[PDB]
Amino acid sequence: GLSDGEWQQVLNVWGKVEADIAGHGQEVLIRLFTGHPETLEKFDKFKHLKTEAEMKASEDLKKHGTVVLTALGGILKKKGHHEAELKPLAQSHATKHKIPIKYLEFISDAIIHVLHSKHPGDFGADAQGAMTKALELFRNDIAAKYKELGFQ
Ligand code: HEM
Numbered sequence: 001g002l003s004d005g006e007w008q009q010v011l012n013v014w015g016k017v018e019a020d021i022a023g024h025g026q027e028v029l030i031r032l033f034t035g036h037p038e039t040l041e042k043f044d045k046f047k048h049l050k051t052e053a054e055m056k057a058s059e060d061l062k063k064h065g066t067v068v069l070t071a072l073g074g075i076l077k078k079k080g081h082h083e084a085e086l087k088p089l090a091q092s093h094a095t096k097h098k099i100p101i102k103y104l105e106f107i108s109d110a111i112i113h114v115l116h117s118k119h120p121g122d123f124g125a126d127a128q129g130a131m132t133k134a135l136e137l138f139r140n141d142i143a144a145k146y147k148e149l150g151f152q
Pocket of ligand 1: 039040042043044045067068069071072088089092093097099103104107
């Protein structure tokens with residue numbers, strides 16, 4: 001649950017992402033894959049990537065980064081009223097991709113890391129607080145659907 005002022009911070013930060021969605025999406029996935037190499041094994045189309053240089057050179061990884069952040073941005077713009085947008089993603093990630101909630105924690109922290117890396121000194125403590133709360137809400141509502149499905 002976020003206040004109006006917190007949502008305003010989230011959507012202000014998101015403007016930074018929308019200026020370069022592919023570059024942000026690429027770096028988020030690279031941070032996930034290099035920090036948590038077990039996550040790469042869930043992607044049949046990226047498991048061939050052995051080095052970060054190959055990851056950086058992969059145009060399909062940048063494409064998928066655009067898909068991921070476009071979906072997340074659509075959810076964030078609903079300011080919590082995201083049941084219709086979130087349900088299909090919860091279902092596909094639990095039942096088809098088999099993504100444990102832990103990996104959603106990993107990618108949430110990766111987003112925070114990338115924002116500081118690309119905007120050092122321009123991602124203030126209030127903005128980090130609000131973005132963190134928004135990603136916690138996203139993860140918590142996914143977790144509720146995971147529990148319904150019995151997925152661990
Ligand atoms: C912010 C969190 C995430 C968002 C918004 C997101 C979004 C998406 C979307 C929109 C798709 C394509 C449609 C679909 O299959 O539902 C997708 C596919 C997929 N996601 Fe995610 N995802 C997220 C996190 C993760 C994480 C953490 C993992 C694994 C560590 C993951 C694994 C996958 C896989 C394996 C696919 C299929 C890729 C393919 O072969 O095309 N997702 N995701």
